Amino acid sequence: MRPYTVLWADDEIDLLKPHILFLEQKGYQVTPVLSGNDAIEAVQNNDFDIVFLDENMPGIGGLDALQKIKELKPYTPVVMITKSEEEHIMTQAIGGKIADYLIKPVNPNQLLLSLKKNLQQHSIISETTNTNYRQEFVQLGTQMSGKLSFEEWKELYRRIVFWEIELEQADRQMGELLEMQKQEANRLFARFVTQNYREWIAKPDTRPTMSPDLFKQKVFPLLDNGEKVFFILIDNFRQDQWESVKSMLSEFYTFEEDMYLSILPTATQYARNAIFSGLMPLQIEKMFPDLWVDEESEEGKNLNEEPMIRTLIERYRKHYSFSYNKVYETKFGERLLGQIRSLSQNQLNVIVLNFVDMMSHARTDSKMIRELASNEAAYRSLTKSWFKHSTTYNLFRSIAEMGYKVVLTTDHGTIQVKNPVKVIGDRSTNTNLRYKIGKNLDYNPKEVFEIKDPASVGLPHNNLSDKFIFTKEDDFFAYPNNYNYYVQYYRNTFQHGGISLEEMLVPVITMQPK
């Protein structure tokens, strides 16, 4: 290697000769200077790896030297090594983007620690992530194997996502080894769902929490305990997207993290209507035929969610005051943000955000989103940018100021599809690549989850359709009339409505304002 270079500025550098010898023995080149002006010049005309800085020096002070050095080379770490214990100096150093602040007398090893932490942090963390994943990779495969409970599935998926993000900043083949494990997880999760889905619908008392159960399990207990709640539903928000925005929200909230199961199809007109109605889609139609819109109509499929909310509140003999707001466009979030505090009168404030859904679909037809979200790390990254720079960030921030509980959840996720499944003859479901509705559908029954009795899984259908077929894993339906184009166009896009961990196992977070 080459040695890391250290520029050290102190009016009494002679008193630090022992420390300089120690660092020089550990492979570091130290250039000493005696003033801020000499340190500034050295930084200007050199490319030092790190800068050590005294505060009290004849001439300009370290805090003033720090400002200049940060404008010249803001990416260069600066450590303040001073005898000052004044809080004012600490405060201004932190504010000046100091990397470390060490109070004299300093143990030389404390300087070694700063040098490693501030110059080799990334490679150290990278090597530990690989090492830790190598240790735990086996434990994850076996944890996967066998017959897992629902709660065991939650923790496994939680563990897989964690490694998805950790291994972004680590070795490649560790990352593609995780992809294999994730692939195997989705396969085994698919069997878990198809073997139990009909029973889940049949026996509502022994089933995991699903869309129709969401409000009863996670909202009503809060409201019944006297608490004021903001139910915020970001449509098409996967588990790994929650993990991406989690740290940002931690500045303002504490979390109780949970997950729950979306119903099939993992689509908005079914799962999200089931949430706000508290019922399986078929039960919405029977009990409230005026609020259900069947898949044929050109009318909107989720325009009646507020009335559904009122029937659910009434259906459990609750008297909650509530509001419902639906946000698509950029301007309407700023407007809702402006009128946010007028909602303080209501116990329950429901907010639906549709942009991640829009963006997720734009991964198919928008060259721009094909660039910004080429892979799932970019998609997560792009989700961070949106959350921070849209009005969503300050919306969550204003709610916290209002002393409101927030239940942050979604209706379904989405998955990056890879391999086609042939199909033909459906009705009006060509728009969805993960589920299909119709009669006389030619397909391979081995490749899908067949629902020939839709009313058994709480699904309505008009007389021109009698069955549902769902994809599994990362498959997507493809027609043969324009097959080769169809396949090249939709491969690697994001699609929902089928069976996968990404689509079905989705977050529900109960957040308390700090």
- Which residues define the annotated binding site for Zn(2+)? 235, 268, 319, 357, 361, 411-412, 496
148-207 residues near a second copy, rule: CB under 8 A: 159, 162
Query: Which of Mg ion, Zn ion, a second copy, none interacts with 411 (beta carbon under 5 to 8 A by kind)?
Result: Zn ion
Structure tokens at 469: 């077929």
Q: Which is nearer to a second copy, 115 or 421 (CB)?
A: 115
477-496 residues near a second copy, rule: CB under 8 A: none
216-275 residues near a second copy, rule: CB under 8 A: 246-247, 250-251, 254
252-271 residues near Zn ion, rule: CB under 5 A: 268
CB contact set of 86 (below 8 Å; sequence gap of 6+): none
Between CA 273 and CA 151 the distance in angstroms is 25
307 touches Mg ion by CB under 5 A: no
What mask, x for binding a second copy by CB under 8 A, covers residues 50 to 79?
-----------------x---x--xxx---
Query: Which of Zn ion, Mg ion, ligand BEF, none interacts with 182 (beta carbon under 5 to 8 A by kind)?
Result: none
Between CA 96 and CA 10 the distance in angstroms is 18
Half-sphere exposure of 366 (CA within 13 A, CB side): 13
Evaluate whether 411 touches 269 at the Cβ level (below 8 Å): no
Q: Which is nearer to ligand BEF, 166 or 357 (CB)?
A: 357
Task: Kindly tell me which residue out of 10, 54, 411, 502 binds Zn ion, with binding defined by CB under 5 A.
Answer: 411
Task: Kindly tell me which residue out of 35, 217, 269, 428 binds ligand BEF, with binding defined by CB under 6 A.
Answer: 269
Q: Where are the alpha helices (DSSP H) in 225-349?
A: 239-250, 273-277, 281-287, 305-315, 330-338
Structure tokens at 83: 């005898």
DSSP 160-204: HHHHHHHGGGS-HHHHHHHHHHHHHHHHHHHHHHHTTHHHHHH-T
Evaluate whether 7 touches 42 at the Cβ level (below 8 Å): yes
54 touches Mg ion by CB under 5 A: yes
Task: Kindly tell me which residue out of 12, 24, 41, 127 binds a second copy, with binding defined by CB under 8 A.
Answer: 127
495 touches Zn ion by CB under 5 A: no
Task: Kindly tell me which residue out of 235, 295, 357, 473 binds a second copy, with binding defined by CB under 8 A.
Answer: 357
E-strand spans in 228-386?
A: 229-234, 253-261, 322-327, 348-353
Residue set of the binding site: 10-12, 54, 56-57, 59, 168, 235, 268, 319, 357, 361, 411-412, 452, 464, 496
E-strand spans in 200-270?
A: 229-234, 253-261
The residue length of the chain stands at: 514
Task: Kindly tell me which residue out of 46, 56, 107, 145 binds Mg ion, with binding defined by CB under 5 A.
Answer: 56
Q: Which is nearer to a second copy, 76 or 194 (CB)?
A: 76
145: helix, strand or coil? coil
61-80 residues near Mg ion, rule: CB under 5 A: 61
Task: Kindly tell me which residue out of 60, 103, 402, 487 binds a second copy, with binding defined by CB under 8 A.
Answer: 103
CB of 302 to Zn ion, least distance (A): 8
Which residues on neighbouring strands pair with residue 351, listed in sequence order? 232, 325
CB of 318 to ligand BEF, least distance (A): 27
Residue set of the binding site for Mg(2+): 10-12, 54, 56-57, 59, 168, 452, 464
Beta strand 435-438 with 467-470 is: antiparallel
Structure tokens at 449: 């989850």
Contact positions toward Zn ion, by CB under 5 A?
235, 268, 357, 411-412
